[PDB]
């Protein structure tokens, strides 16, 4: 038939432009999975920079602290020799003596606590600019890899905007029925699902049509569809 040859090759340039805004997505989707490993790759790292920011910041504070303690039992030794200075009485001597060999023990054990929070401090610092400069450097060789996706990204937009426009113009002179038939197909394949007999075969599926089916499509007039993908089979 003249009207179902015109059927057919109106479906089949919307079939075109249907298969390039497949690709379209597809690559997309690709491109922003690219930028989300990307920043992905960043927000690690920021986020051991700011655990080891946080961490430094107990380390400030415990070596403040521990200081400030030292300097606390350092002037109680002190005070306590002045008195011992002046003591008469043996018990009282005595007293002091062992007061400030607790306290200096004391004194000793905070001051190797205070050595070991100042080495962590030390390393930890040495860690976090390490992470700083690796941060600096993830990004500085990242951007214009970005850019260069996000631009393509960009471009496929707008092509996918010009092909949906052409799409819609040619859904106006298409035949309904077999847009109808020709959508659920795609939507259920995503690729071509108007499809021409080649050596006999369907080539959608490449399942040898029985000779009276080829028959059937020469005809060319109704919708023969293969008996075991379901694609609409057209000659020629
Ligand atoms: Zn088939």
New binding site residues.
């Given amino acids: 038939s003249n009207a179902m040859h015109d059927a057919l090759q109106s479906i089949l340039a919307i079939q075109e432009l249907d298969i390039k805004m497949i690709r379209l997505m597809r690559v997309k989707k690709e491109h922003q999975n690219e930028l989300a490993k990307i920043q992905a790759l960043k927000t690690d790292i920021r986020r051991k920079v700011e655990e080891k920011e946080q961490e430094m910041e107990k380390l400030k504070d415990q070596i403040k602290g521990g200081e400030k303690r030292i300097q606390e039992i350092s002037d109680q030794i002190n005070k306590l020799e002045n008195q011992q200075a002046a003591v008469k009485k043996m018990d009282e001597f005595n007293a002091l003596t062992q007061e400030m060999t607790a306290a200096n023990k004391e004194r000793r054990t905070l001051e190797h606590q205070l050595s070991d929070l100042m080495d962590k401090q030390a390393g930890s610092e040495d860690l976090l600019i390490s992470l700083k400069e690796s941060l600096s450097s993830t990004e500085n060789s990242s951007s214009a890899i970005e850019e260069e996706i996000r631009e393509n990204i960009r471009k496929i937009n707008e092509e996918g905007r010009s092909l949906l426009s052409q799409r819609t113009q040619l859904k106006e002179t298409t035949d309904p029925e077999l847009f109808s038939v020709y959508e659920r197909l795609l939507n259920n394949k995503k690729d071509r699902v108007v499809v021409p007999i080649e050596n006999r075969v369907?080539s959608?599926?490449h399942?040898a049509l029985t000779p009276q089916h080829e028959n059937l499509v020469r005809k060319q007039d109704h919708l023969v569809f293969?008996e075991?993908?379901s694609?609409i089979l057209y000659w020629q």
């Fill in positions: 369907c959608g599926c399942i293969c075991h993908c694609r």
